[PDB]
Design a binder for this molecule. Sequence first.
Ligand code: PAM
Length: 133
Amino acid sequence: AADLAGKWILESSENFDDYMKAVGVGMVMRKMANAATPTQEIKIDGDSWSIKTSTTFKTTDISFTIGQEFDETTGDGRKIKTTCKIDGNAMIQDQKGSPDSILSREVKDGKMHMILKVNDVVCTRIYKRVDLE
Ligand SMILES: CCCCCC/C=C\CCCCCCCC(=O)O
């Protein structure tokens, strides 16, 4: 999963609105989030990670150690317990709360595929790399 490092910008999205409805995001915030073109900046040092997700209206920042449970507050404001692990090509962010959700990221054919799963909803968001320097 080491190649997730760098900067990424959203290229395509499928079923994000239903994902947000399932986790309880309100109407106005869904309007903003659906229209957004977020960037993700991912840094990796050994088993230490950070991920900054930026939009014009909201930024989230998390930092963690692979395998170590930590407190996360999501962009929409849910308090959850998160554990991240590496599974070959993918880094999986397993979120416990109300509701639970699974977020996976992996690079394929040069693009970061982020799959978000909650209850019976699956959302796929594909990011293109932004070259740094
Ligand atoms: C900075 C990101 C905040 C986006 C607005 C908050 C609304 C919904 C958040 C749902 C959980 C996080 C989804 C992340 C999707 C993605 O990174 O493309």
